[PDB]
Design a protein around this ligand. Structure first.
Ligand SMILES: CN[C@H]1CC[C@H](C(F)(F)F)CC1
Length: 330
């Protein structure tokens, strides 16, 4: 089997991407944030505290003839941005882009934090990291990809995120029309439950490439590119007036600037992030200070190749017995 679904930016900045997901019988379609940095499929639901729902589409398990309470199971998750959610668990039929999994754990939110209430565009998360991170207790549950894997034509999914435009998540096949040149594959460590890999280095604009190992995670559920402070300082030094602002919480730059590109290494290959991809717009409405798309990972404890990086590539998440990542230009 295969599946193919379009992913759409939630706003004009690409702060996140939503992908429609069918849950239950008859189908209830929710728009979920596909997140290669976590391993829970959770949804706004009929169980979510009413004051914490503001415009999201909810899953109602009582209206699904295939929904079953997973007796005794609870879940509770915290993300890197300090957001959180928790609740109980159903199994149900879940389809993405024509690919169907029966008996998928669908984590129903009883509580969500303020950032999830305040974002009407995201109806929940679909985790695509390794199932060792899944938070369901007392019986840990598998991701949608882990449940689908054996049925797929090839044990892979791909992320093809757009810049200010829709893109695609494919399951079970590699669309050879979706990228240029060749796909370079690189080793993955699953020891932290992430798609963790080591970039071979970077360049800033037309500058020389610096060969240096940068260990980090491929994380579709993080907006920005988080790298070591040395690398980030080197990038923003090329932008007149850019500075790290303690009050804003990262690098800002004059909105009048033209940003340089940023290149990262994948083995001997290179992925170029155009400068425009690094502009996250005014820090507040009408400001001439703009928020940078490359930020320091200092204090986070890991480097994160988030959407700013991934949207410059066609990315293969190879779930073979020994997982690997692939990157192509596009
Ligand atoms: C912006 N609201 C949420 C969206 C999901 C994010 C992640 F994917 F990481 F789970 C966290 C913040």
């Amino acid at each position: 089997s295969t599946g193919s679904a379009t992913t759409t930016p939630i706003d004009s900045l690409d702060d996140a991407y939503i992908t429609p997901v069918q849950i239950g019988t008859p189908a209830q379609t929710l728009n979920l944030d596909f997140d290669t940095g976590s391993s829970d499929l959770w949804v706004f639901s009929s169980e979510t505290t009413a004051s914490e729902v503001d415009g999201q589409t909810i899953y109602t398990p009582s209206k699904s003839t295939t929904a079953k309470l997973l007796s005794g199971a609870t879940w509770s998750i915290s993300y890197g941005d300090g957001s959180s959610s928790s609740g109980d668990v159903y199994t149900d039929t879940v389809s993405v882009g024509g690919l169907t999994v029966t008996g998928q754990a669908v984590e129903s939110a009883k509580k969500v934090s303020s950032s999830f209430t305040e974002d009407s565009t995201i109806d929940g998360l679909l985790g695509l990291a390794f199932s060792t991170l899944n938070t369901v207790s007392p019986t840990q549950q598998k991701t949608f990809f882990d449940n689908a894997k054996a049925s797929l034509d090839s044990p892979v999914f791909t992320a093809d995120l757009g810049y200010h435009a829709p893109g695609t998540y494919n399951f079970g096949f590699i669309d050879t029309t979706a990228y240029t040149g060749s796909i370079t594959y690189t080793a993955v460590s699953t020891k932290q439950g992430f798609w963790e890999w080591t970039s071979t280095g970077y360049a800033v604009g037309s500058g020389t490439f610096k060969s240096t190992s940068i260990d980090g995670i491929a994380d579709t559920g993080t907006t920005l590119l988080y790298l070591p402070a040395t690398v980030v300082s080197a990038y923003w030094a090329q932008v007149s007036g850019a500075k790290s602002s303690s009050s804003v919480g990262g690098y800002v730059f004059p909105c009048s600037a033209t940003l340089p590109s940023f290149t990262f290494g994948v083995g001997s290959a290179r992925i170029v992030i155009p400068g425009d991809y690094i502009d996250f717009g005014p820090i507040s409405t009408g400001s001439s200070s703009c928020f940078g798309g490359i930020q320091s990972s200092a204090g986070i404890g890991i480097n994160i190749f988030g959407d700013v990086a991934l949207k410059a590539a066609f990315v293969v998440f190879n779930g073979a017995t020994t997982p690997t990542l692939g990157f192509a230009s596009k």
